[PDB]
Amino acid sequence: GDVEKGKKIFIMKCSQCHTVEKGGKHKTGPNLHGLFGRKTGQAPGYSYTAANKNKGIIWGEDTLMEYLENPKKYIPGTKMIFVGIKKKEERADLIAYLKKATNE
Numbered sequence: 001g002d003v004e005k006g007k008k009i010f011i012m013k014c015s016q017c018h019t020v021e022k023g024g025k026h027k028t029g030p031n032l033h034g035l036f037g038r039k040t041g042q043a044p045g046y047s048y049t050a051a052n053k054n055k056g057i058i059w060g061e062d063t064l065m066e067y068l069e070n071p072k073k074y075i076p077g078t079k080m081i082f083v084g085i086k087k088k089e090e091r092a093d094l095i096a097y098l099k100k101a102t103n104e
C-alpha cells in the first residue's frame with residue numbers, strides 16, 4: 001500500500017485532471033474527495049460523461065481495481081484518457097495513497 005509511490009503516480013497519473021483536495025475543480029476530470037462510498041454522476045454542476053451516469057455503480061476498492069484496469073471499457077464514452085493499469089501492487093498502492101489522500 002505504498003502511499004509515497006501512489007503520490008508520484010497520481011501526481012502525474014490521475015491528479016493530472018482529478019484533484020484529491022476537498023474543494024477541487026471540475027477540470028478535465030472530476031474531484032476525488034470521498035469518491036469511496038458514493039454513487040457516480042453525483043458531482044452536481046459537472047459535465048460528466050453520458051457513460052459516467054450510464055454505469056451507475058458504487059465506487060470502492062473493487063469497482064476501482066476493475067474500473068481502473070479499463071476506464072474506457074467500464075465507462076464507454078468516457079473522456080478520461082487512460083490506457084489502464086495491470087500491476088496489482090501498483091493499483092493497490094496507488095489506491096492506498098488515495099485512502100490517505102482523499103481519506104486522509
Ligand code: HEC
Nearest residue numbers: 013014016017028029030035049051052075078079080081
Ligand atoms: C483526465 C484526462 C483524467 C485522467 C488522467 C483520469 N481521469 Fe478519472 N475521470 C475523468 C473524467 C472526465 C471522469 C468522468 C467520466 C467517467 O465516467 O469516468 C472520470 C471518472 C473517473 C471515475 C468515476 C467517477 C469519479 O471517480 O470521479 C473514477 C473512479 C476515476 N475517474 C478514477 C481515476 C483514476 C484513479 C485515474 C488514474 C489511475 C484517473 N481517474 C485518470 C478524467 C480523468
